[PDB]
From a paper:
Here we report the use of single particle cryo-EM to identify multiple proteins from three enriched heterogeneous fractions prepared from human liver mitochondrial lysate. Using this approach, we were able to simultaneously identify and solve cryo-EM structures of nine different human mitochondrial enzymes: short chain acyl-CoA dehydrogenase (SCAD), medium chain acyl-CoA dehydrogenase (MCAD), isovaleryl-CoA dehydrogenase (IVD), delta (3, 5)-delta dienoyl-CoA isomerase (ECH1), aspartate aminotransferase (GOT2), glutamate dehydrogenase (GLUD1), mitochondrial superoxide dismutase 2 (SOD2), catalase (CAT), and mitochondrial aldehyde dehydrogenase (ALDH2). Functionally, the three acyl-CoA dehydrogenases—SCAD, MCAD and IVD—are involved in beta oxidation and amino acid catabolism. Finally, SOD2, CAT, and ALDH2 are all involved in clearing toxic byproducts of oxidative respiration.
Functionally, mammalian GDH uses NADH or NADPH as a cofactor in order to deaminate glutamate to 2-oxoglutarate, a key intermediate in the Krebs cycle. We collected a total of 62,508 particles for this class of protein images. From these projections, we were able to construct a 2.31 Å resolution cryo-EM map and identify the structure as the GLUD1 enzyme. In agreement with previous human and bovine crystal structures, GLUD1 consists of six subunits that form the functional homohexamer. Each individual subunit consists of an N-terminal glutamate-binding domain (residues 63–266), the NADH-binding domain (267–448 and 528–556), and the antenna domain (449–501). The GTP-binding site is bracketed by several key basic residues, including H266, R274, R318, R322, and H507, as well additional residues I269, S270, and Y319. There is a large degree of conformational flexibility in both the NADH-binding domain and antenna domain, particularly in the unbound state. Additionally, mutations in the antenna domain have also been linked to hyperinsulinism.
Residue numbers in the entry:
A (entry chain D), B (entry chain E), C (entry chain B): 62 to 557
């Protein structure tokens, strides 16, 4: 089947654009003919679809052994409506112009869903990182940054790179240092050229768990909605809920940790090399400790190895958080999970979606679910522009206000009841006291992430209801994104 | 009589400058002779008065019919003390250099009254907008922006245009797009080049009702001040208060809506083509619905047409919110309203002010009253610089703090009274619950607007008290503004 | 066969790079092993080959009928060694990334041959210009310029566009005006953003005949070289020389005009729709006048239509100045011309070159021959940077020096011979007098063009002699270009 960076993304836009065409024509305030309005709506939808800027590079590096190599790189920007763009850099041998174009378009709609004011971008360097030493990878990253900077593709007001799976926070420091040295110069905002930096460099707390927390909040919003749970025939809330996590990466680990924290039970954990199964439940902390020392999850005590395919395991909800095309037309009928939460990008095929829709299996789209990382990278970009950590000037002030409020209640009650009843001490609870003492930037970031996922989930539900979609949340997510990008471009003031 | 853009504004400064001259000399910490001090005070007051930069343009456009036209435009900046400047663009056939100069000076003092750190500016394009199509008006606006940008007159750190009566949010999009395309380039702050943009483009919620809310808060501050109400012989508060709104535009509609929301009664509504009168009261919602479909307010049921002049109607307070020179020396003696709230700009003549002062009629100045729009445009400018909507990172965090505070009260009370009394559930009230659920950026903007109008009203009262002025709030408003602009320039560090 | 923008250009580099590899290793001053030197030479040759920057665009325009269209454009820059780049813009439906990449590489070596300090560039807009009105083509050109400018692809110090066949001087004015309006701003050198402008805008005199003059000077250098003419068995000089021009475009017309001016005879003129033949000769002026009014050359008096193929006509030299692949393996054996002068780009196939080399037919490469246009565009770029026409400050000064020199000769002779012989008036000849009176910028430009073509021809001859090439001037031209680009990059100070 076609991969995620393939006509799937283009097909998603095409299906979404056709759906929104009728409504946009009707709700158009401009005075013109119906044919004139329909051409205008279809005309703008054609402008939105392609990536307006794509840069192809070829720059040399000299390897440690002394040989000479020419490295190809790409950077596709999808910004007809908003600047700056935001997108990761992928170091892989199979990157291509078509791939970065598709992923740049995908990031545009992902940012629109969570109301992040960024365009889409994506970079690719056609190397295999395992065949280069750390000294060589630094030279590749620095040289790639220089070529991007000279052509106006990496600036804080232009295009903000982000970490991908193949690039860590070490590479982001190389990008940030290179940008400031050459073209950032003495710009005050040059620190915000890149996101995913270490904490000491202006990075944000809670970035590691960002994608995992977003997955949890995405599920939580749809698990507490009575209308959807009635369709699935399940009780609202996480009470007596069992989930299976396919893949134990960064997303899978943190998603399980926050789900177990709220009463959910992990009855099985999948992996490429094996599977784990326990009806009683799997402790996220114990499994994490086992994985980091043994190098894998097989042989983990308190749970026998699973028999069969982890995807077909009986569970209330399922979390495919690794690889692509895990759910296909072949295995879709045997899936016993009422809810599928796409932690990874494109774990289900378009054919599989049709079977799930028939079987009344809610599939929370990857476009919305794993957007927690994009949201937090937006917060880090804001933090570097603010040049101050969140809450630094307000934590002490809010603490004093909270104690003044409690003293107001205490004094008011004491004079109401007089000497009778003695003194009524009003003190913060243990949970509140820990919140007051341990107040830090990560509390603000997690609060903002939870607010974004909650608000976007409500918008997707309204979009699904308006267009008479049922459990097809994927189309609703794309339709919701298409409308936002359409409105921004339509009112952008560009020449028509 | 002289219009608002006429020697009235110059006369207001001249009267205010003479009043403040004596006090400024005495409260001057510099060591010099009395003659040296008085020359310095008068010397700076001469620097403040004129507009330091005025640009006259003449640029061509080609009309749709193919003919050629040369359009004249102006942009006066009044910034000897602060940058950036802020001011609207007026499309009118009768604009002139003198008019934009006077309005640029007026905006400087209006910004100073509400503590908005902007200089004054004003633009004028000598065209009649009704004689041009939308395609032509876009070309005029874009070309006017390009000429302004090349001469350093439209930048976000230089001069921020604002919407006027003759220009809507559509024009602001044209200005913003033109600036970013040509000279804004990839500046991160290029979004803040203009205010009044649509919401999708970075506009701010609550801009439409901003001027109306400011009028309400301006009246409210002076209606609850016991000292002033004692002079007028009226009880404080809006209880049993009747008001008449002359003009039913954007300012008149929203001013009536918020006044009626707080117990005031609208007994009459004026208009150019007719008048409405009802001692029982007029519902703002019903009248608004009637106006938007019938195109006017005449023939509105539940109220007979008024007989005579709407300005002389018997009411507690009066709101002239349309046109100029409505209150003159001729009709001033017959006015039966104890309070006049200048919603529009210059609705009273200087001669009329003298009669009102004799009759003990408080006239809340237009310089302060209709400054709500300027304040909110300041907030929108800050929002575009912040690159995030207000409260996005704090709404969820504050909600959790509020619930922790209530749980602290509940647990403290429960352990105080033990099992006796059972559980004491502490939950937010219905009004608070709506505030928590419906929390949005417009709540922050309305809060900031109310704080600004409250603080400025207190400053004007102190200025009126210090200079022994009575009900002459107009002079107090100008005197208050003159002192602030004097202090900023005196301490600006410019060469003396 | 493969077109000119195809693996032909890549094949030319590959053959040339292999030839120069041996010599470059030997003449390397760095101290290292032979294997280390050979890797360094081969390593740099790999860096030179690809285009380092390629930009793909997709921007919208609205057609006059109101419909919406998305236009694709490309701009390939080939600059690892020199900046700025220089290259034309082609409006064609069949443009592609591979095509602009090949032509950008070709321009790099063409500039190197004539010692023009520019890198290679090429742009393509995938439209058919005949399907758009002049209003639409202006919007396409202006919008294409804006996108190029924002990404650093059109600046005077970055990349200077030039006119192609499909774009005239009208488009260059659109590009220049758009650049100055948006990003050129008030840069003093913003006038030099583009070349091929009209004279009033800073264009250079003699641009129209530049390519034709270069073809003449290219032939003249190789027609007066005794060594080459001995191989061909022809007398040096243009005396009793007959030439055939295939194609009567701008290049064909001017090439014939200057050849006939120096004694050569045009016995035949080819064309797509017909052919003209006259052993007596064809007057360039009469044929030009006939063409501009009848729209073609068929039916031209004083010459019967030619029978057969114009390429096989018996002539001393042949000038293919139209289309591509005119000389193939099929017709190569029947060609009766001793010299082939490639006025157009790629009129001979690589297979045809082998037959010509066997038959001792000298083929003057198109890489060098039609480089007159590139040289003059370099002069125009210098003129815009100088902000003064050539010779404006020197024509009068040199005229006075010339007359002083003649007066010195006259007075010296008069006193030598005394009264005997009377006066010896030393006056300029008629040819010199016309040169003095009609002195203008075009004289300087034509002088510089002739000097460049002469010097480059000598360099190509030395390169052909050094590498033991015979009449294979095409490989010598590429080998000469490869060495120059190699040396510039090797000594550029880039990291190795």
């Amino acid at each position: 089947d076609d991969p995620n960076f393939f006509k799937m993304v283009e097909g998603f836009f095409d299906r979404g654009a056709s759906i929104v065409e009728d409504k946009l024509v009707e709700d158009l305030r401009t005075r013109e003919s119906e044919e004139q309005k329909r051409n205008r709506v279809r005309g703008i939808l054609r402008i939105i679809k392609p990536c307006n800027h794509v840069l192809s590079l070829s720059f040399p590096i000299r390897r440690d052994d002394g040989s000479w190599e020419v490295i190809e790189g790409y950077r596709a920007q999808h910004s007809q409506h908003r600047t700056p763009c935001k997108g990761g850099i992928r170091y892989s041998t199979d990157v291509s112009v078509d791939e970065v174009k598709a992923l740049a378009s995908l990031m545009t709609y992902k940012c629109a869903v969570v109301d992040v004011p960024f365009g889409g971008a994506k970079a690719g360097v056609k190397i295999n990182p395992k065949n280069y030493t750390d000294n060589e990878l630094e030279k590749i990253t620095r040289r790639f940054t220089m070529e991007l900077a000279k052509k106006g593709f990496i600036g804080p007001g232009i295009d903000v790179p982000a970490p991908d799976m193949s690039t860590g926070e070490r590479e982001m420091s190389w990008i940030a240092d290179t940008y400031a040295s050459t073209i950032g110069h003495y710009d005050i905002n040059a620190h915000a050229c890149v996101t995913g930096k270490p904490i000491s460099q202006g990075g944000i707390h809670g970035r590691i768990s960002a994608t995992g927390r977003g997955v949890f909040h995405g599920i939580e919003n749809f698990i507490n909605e009575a209308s959807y749970m009635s369709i699935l025939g399940m009780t609202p809330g996480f009470g007596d809920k069992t989930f299976v996590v396919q893949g134990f990466g960064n997303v899978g680990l943190h998603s399980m940790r926050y789900l177990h924290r709220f009463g959910a039970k992990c009855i099985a954990v999948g992996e490429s090399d094996g599977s784990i199964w326990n009806p009683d439940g799997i402790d996220p902390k114990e499994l994490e400790d086992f994985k980091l020392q043994h190098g894998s999850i097989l042989g983990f005590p308190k749970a026998k190895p699973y028999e069969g395919s982890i995807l077909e395991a009986d569970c209330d909800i399922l979390i495919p958080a690794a690889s692509e095309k895990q759910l296909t037309k072949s295995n879709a009928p045997r899936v016993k999970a009422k809810i599928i939460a796409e932690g990874a990008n494109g774990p289900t095929t378009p054919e599989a979606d049709k079977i799930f829709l028939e079987r009344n299996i809610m599939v929370i789209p990857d476009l919305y679910l794993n957007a927690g990382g994009v949201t937090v990278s937006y917060f880090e970009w804001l933090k570097n522009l603010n040049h101050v950590s969140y809450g630094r000037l307000t934590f002490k002030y809010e603490r004093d206000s909270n104690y003044h409020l409690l003293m107001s209640v205490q004094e008011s009650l004491e004079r109401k009841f007089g000497k009778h009843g003695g003194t009524i001490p009003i003190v913060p609870t243990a949970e509140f006291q820990d919140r007051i003492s341990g107040a830090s930037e990560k509390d603000i970031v997690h609060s903002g992430l939870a607010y974004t996922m909650e608000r976007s989930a409500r918008q997707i539900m309204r979009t699904a209801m308006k267009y008479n979609l049922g459990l097809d949340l994927r189309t609703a997510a794309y339709v919701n994104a298409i409308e936002k990008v359409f409105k921004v471009y339509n009112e952008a003031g560009v020449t028509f």
